[PDB]
Design a binder for this molecule. Structure first.
Ligand SMILES: N=C(N)c1cccc(C=O)c1
Ligand SMILES: [Ca+2]
Length: 223
């Protein structure tokens, strides 16, 4: 997250870190056994880390649970990043409490202008490279589909939306991928892609979660 703020320990209780020997992506806990992330985050040997603030220090609220299975969206295209969504099942159910909690799925899509909270342990610099140890947060509005398409000609599908600031300086970044965009307590987006980070006229692009609620529910119901 570039241009954001320190969230505060366990203030984003649905935020997960995906770990394969090191943090490599975010995710969102959607019930005691399932995490939503980006398909582009797919790899084998994932350990889901819940209750994290400092990802380099054991602070007392962590739950580390190995993934038992991953399900990339049937229509994920890695070239265009269309349908950039994946489900991860935990080997055991997470113990839910105030600091480890699921986030609600939307029942309808969010509109341009809605303020959302975007979070992660990704790069904090738009030019350089600096990775934070503690969870970073950004409040950002959803942008109109027209401005999103104007920013990224030929690249925005109906499964994507833009959020952030066309002026630059405030954005998600490398390492935030797969993490949440939460709007009025609903998971509306997944950190998916962008051109650089926090660049002028290049806002963040997010997977449009409301399109996938049917697929998520039915997938969970049979797995
Ligand atoms: N600018 C962003 N919001 C973003 C998100 C995820 C990855 C990347 C970099 O390729 C950029
Ligand atoms: Ca920790």
């Amino acid at each position: 997250i570039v241009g954001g703020y320190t969230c505060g320990a366990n203030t984003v209780p649905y935020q997960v870190s995906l770990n394969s020997g090191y943090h490599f992506c975010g995710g969102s806990l959607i019930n005691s056994q399932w995490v939503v992330s980006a398909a582009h985050c797919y790899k084998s040997g994932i350990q889901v880390r819940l209750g994290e603030d400092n990802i380099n220090v054991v602070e007392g609220n962590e739950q580390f649970i190995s993934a038992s299975k991953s399900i990339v969206h049937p229509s994920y295209n890695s070239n265009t990043l269309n349908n950039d969504i994946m489900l991860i099942k935990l080997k055991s159910a997470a113990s839910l409490n105030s600091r480890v909690a699921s986030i609600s799925l939307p029942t309808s899509c969010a509109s341009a202008g809605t303020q959302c909270l975007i979070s992660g342990w990704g790069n904090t610099k738009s030019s350089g490279t600096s990775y934070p140890d503690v969870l970073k947060c950004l409040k950002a509005p959803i942008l109109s589909d027209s401005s999103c398409k104007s920013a990224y000609p030929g690249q925005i599908t109906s499964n994507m939306f833009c959020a952030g600031y066309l002026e630059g300086g405030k954005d998600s970044c490398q390492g935030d991928s797969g993490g949440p965009v939460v709007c009025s307590g609903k998971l509306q987006g997944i950190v998916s892609w962008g051109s650089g980070c926090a660049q002028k006229n290049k806002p963040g692009v997010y997977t449009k979660v409301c399109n996938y609620v049917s697929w998520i529910k039915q997938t969970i119901a049979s797995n």
